[PDB]
Symmetry: none
Amino acid sequence: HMRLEDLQEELKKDVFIDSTKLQYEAANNVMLYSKWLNKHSSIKKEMLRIEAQKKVALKARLDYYSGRGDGDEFSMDRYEKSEMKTVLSADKDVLKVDTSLQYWGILLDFCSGALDAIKSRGFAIKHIQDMRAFEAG
Amino acid sequence: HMRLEDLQEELKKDVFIDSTKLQYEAANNVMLYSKWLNKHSSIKKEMLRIEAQKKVALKARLDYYSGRGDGDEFSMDRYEKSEMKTVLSADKDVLKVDTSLQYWGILLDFCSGALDAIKSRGFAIKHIQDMRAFE
Amino acid sequence: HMRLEDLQEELKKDVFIDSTKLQYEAANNVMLYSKWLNKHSSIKKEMLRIEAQKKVALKARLDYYSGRGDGDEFSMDRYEKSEMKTVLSADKDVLKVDTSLQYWGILLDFCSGALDAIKSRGFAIKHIQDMRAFEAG
Amino acid sequence: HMRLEDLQEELKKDVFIDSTKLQYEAANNVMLYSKWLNKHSSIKKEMLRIEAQKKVALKARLDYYSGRGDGDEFSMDRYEKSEMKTVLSADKDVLKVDTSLQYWGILLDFCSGALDAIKSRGFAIKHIQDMRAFEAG
Amino acid sequence: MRLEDLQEELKKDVFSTKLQYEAANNVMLYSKWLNKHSSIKKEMLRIEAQKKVALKARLDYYSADKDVLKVDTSLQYWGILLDFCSGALDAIKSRGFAIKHIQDMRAF
Amino acid sequence: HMRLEDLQEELKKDVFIDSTKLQYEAANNVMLYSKWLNKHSSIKKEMLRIEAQKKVALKARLDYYSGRGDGDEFSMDRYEKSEMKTVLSADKDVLKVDTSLQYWGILLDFCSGALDAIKSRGFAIKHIQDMRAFEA
Amino acid sequence: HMRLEDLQEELKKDVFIDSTKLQYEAANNVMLYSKWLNKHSSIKKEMLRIEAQKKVALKARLDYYSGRGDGDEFSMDRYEKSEMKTVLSADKDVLKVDTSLQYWGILLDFCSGALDAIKSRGFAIKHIQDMRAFEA
């Protein structure tokens, strides 16, 4: 289980550009894109597993609250169809799984932004090179 | 708990472009994007925690008003199903949590706009460089 | 309490483009976006406070009309459930708060349009620059 | 009280594009957007005032027809709950206010379409510029 | 007016020898149909108001026998006319997209 | 059935640029694009087959839960129309097929990013060549 | 019906650059673009015919399941409006036509990528030529 703050610090380090090694950064920029692309794809792989758990968790707990069988356990609060969306989204089991799924979703949205930065950093490097050539004439 | 006005002043400072250091701003523009991207992602992390509280807070207070048990406390006003949406959204506990969640939502929408500005500032810098080359 | 007409005149001034200082406007366009983004975000902060008042105001006056207690005051008109939506939306206290909330909503929708103009003004400036380069060849 | 036909003629004039001054129209297109955005926002400000009147007008006349007090005046037709929606929507006071509110609603929907045209006119201008560059090669 | 003229008007505008003048006239066609769409809505507002008062008249039968049926009939006519203008506004919006497609189809 | 981690390691190897053979990498960059383009297209071919299974799997299990016939088998839980979307998305057969489809979807989105990297790597190589000419 | 793997192998062959005949490849690169442009356009011509069949196939089978068919066949499962999208997308006739249409869609998306490679290969050749002049 990786942390968000670990990715934040990692991105802040990778995004930095070395002005002295502009030729190095140009080839390394495409390398950084591959690293986060691996992270982004791996996160979706994790979310697919969690979403599968959430889908089952909902149906399982839906049976519980709606009076059906969820492991020989039954809800006695007798919730109506209108009250259902509120109760399920607040269930201890459901909320635990969903919170997990949504967290990796934030990590995924971060990697999407990370790739956006790298894709624009590669343009930034090429732009800087054009600025150096501008001083040359 | 960070404030909105603190982000407003921070963005207004970062968005400013130094005409003398155009090469510096080009590399720094991508740096600013990473800073707000960290803020944006961290806010969602906070909202996920608050939303979880709100989800439970609703179900807890729903039991209270609907005659069910919420810590051996019961509502005696006997609200109907039609009146429910109005009462819950005005509950002291619910409104307190929701207001918190919605506030960070404004902060999140601000960071989304901040990233939009930076993404266009990087284009603005490159455009200015093309204007200098035009002369 | 800011006025709408004050924002209308402010936007009309900011949106104007100086043809002589195209390089200046390009960097200033991103600056204007930040100004209205601060306004837009601040308005939502205000609306969140007002909406909170409205939510309570409704529940408070709902008790009043439905025969429940609203500060030892009771409605004697005996309104039915069907008549309720009409009466509450016309209550002096409710209508005062809602009108306030809806007003800032118009201001918010104006800032959203203002940001849309600035976002397209930045494209307009870049387009004009491309038109000047077109005359060059 | 502005008229619809006045806005129709105003829009038809603004939407026209000068082929000789393409650079001028590009900067002026963003200016026209600000003009109608001020109109659109101002109309909503007017509707908010009228809607407030309508909300009260309904509740006031609701008391009248339902046997309650509306300025020491009472309806003797004894309308039932089923007949209420038809009677209120045809009341002289209510219909007068609603007609006003709905009219500015048409003006508002026109400004929304006007902004849509301007937003696409800015794309039309940029497209035309790309067509001129196409003949250049 | 007539529905017939509306079909001949739209089918004639939807259609190259002067591409720069056709792209600048695409927003012009929009204004011509925008003023038309809002004018239909204007005439119906008067009709919809007369229908309400006529609906109360039919209700006061307990308190021409079908006056509102003469109003609702003409009201259902403009509804068709209003739905044919919404397609036009949806067409010109797609015509500008089809006009931008040609300039992209010529460079491809 | 190919793995994601196998593509991750493969991309990380291909994306690397040899500074000594810049002329070689320029012609090889367009070659790498063709390789992943073949992968990307082949994955869509696989997904089209799986999606077809999923479409049938849904309709088959929909009959089961809604009281209709799914191979002489019937659901007795009597689920309502509101409960349907939740139950179907959690069915053992459906979830198995969907998980498969979504997985190749991740592989497909990875190839799309891989092609994006190669398309920008070709620009990176040309940029580096322009930087070497700048020193000249 | 052409195969995807046949196009994959064909592209992999065309994309290769001969370093000895750089002048030849420069003129041939524009030739390859025309070849795939003919393929791309021809595929759309095929898809237009298939899409027309799909449009009719849907409306035909829609009548069947909804009971509004003037034909001899009627569906007795009595599907509701909510269940309709799932049933139609899983119909034997519909799924057969759609699968065909989607397949050529993959071929079309491949040709679009092929043209992208050729368009960048022409830049790759010119870049390599500039690299040879750099050594000069």
